[PDB]
Write a protein that binds this ligand. Structure first.
Ligand SMILES: [Mg+2]
Ligand SMILES: [Mg+2]
Length: 254
């Protein structure tokens, strides 16, 4: 059975290096490479998504690479999404990981360059990271082809066994959570989390909004204005707080 795998991550996070090591052999050719490798009589079509720092659609140009990647994660179905994070800049790369896990999609966090972090006298509790994120957090180094081969086996087992996904608990605020629950039913029948789609709708992500009827569009529009706090400010603040406490727990100074 053929399995669709999406490799997404920050630019220069090792996301590209993993894809080339695994698969061997468009209009966004910056970071749109499709590859294939076979393991245990099953095929693995991989799509290297452009390196991005956050999720955002475009049509405004200068953001085509980002728009392509954001669109794929939100529409293009995939059996698992390999999110590569560079341990050296841990906090920076986790912003997309938070948005990714919010989608409630099969996810595998692959921590890269863990060896370099040891040299900086920084140690990481990968196990504690797995508990907070609720998704498989695997650690390797994409440079090591030996470790890359070991990763193929872990992925195949994980894909067949099923990816256990413990929903991330965020609680932006009852003020925001009330609005989210009111828009959740519109996105029930999707491929991504209905909750996440409403949050993106409340952030005025036109990509999600354009799939809405004009009437439902006006209903969503009104919710943005009938707020005592700016949606963008509130969402960003909650996301930052979670990231900071997460990093301070799993990290260790010497
Ligand atoms: Mg109200
Ligand atoms: Mg209109």
């Amino acid at each position: 059975m053929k399995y669709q795998v999406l490799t997404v991550g920050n630019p220069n996070s090792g996301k590209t290096t993993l894809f080339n090591g695994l698969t061997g052999a468009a209009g966004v050719t910056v970071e749109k490479k499709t590859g294939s490798f076979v393991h245990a009589g099953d095929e693995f079509s991989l799509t290297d998504l452009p390196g991005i720092y956050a999720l955002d659609s475009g049509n405004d140009s200068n953001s085509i690479d980002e728009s392509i990647a954001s669109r794929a994660v939100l529409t293009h179905p995939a059996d698992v999404i390999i999110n590569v994070v560079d341990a050296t800049c841990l906090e920076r790369s986790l912003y997309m990981t938070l948005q990714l896990r919010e989608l409630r999609r099969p996810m595998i966090v692959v921590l890269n360059k863990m060896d370099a972090l040891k040299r900086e006298r920084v140690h990481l509790d990968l196990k504690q990271l797995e508990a907070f994120l609720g998704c498989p957090v695997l650690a390797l180094s994409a440079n090591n082809k030996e470790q890359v081969r070991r990763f193929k086996e872990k992925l195949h087992k994980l894909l067949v066994q099923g990816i256990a996904l413990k929903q991330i608990e965020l609680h932006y605020g009852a003020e925001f959570e009330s609005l989210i629950h009111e828009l959740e039913p519109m996105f029930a029948e999707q491929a991504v989390s209905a909750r996440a789609l409403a949050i993106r709708a409340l952030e005025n992500d036109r990509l999600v909004i354009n799939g809405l009827k004009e009437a439902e569009r006006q209903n969503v529009e009104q919710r943005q204005h009938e707020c005592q706090v700016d949606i963008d400010l509130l969402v960003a603040n909650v996301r930052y707080t979670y990231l900071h406490e997460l990093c301070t727990h799993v990290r260790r100074t010497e």
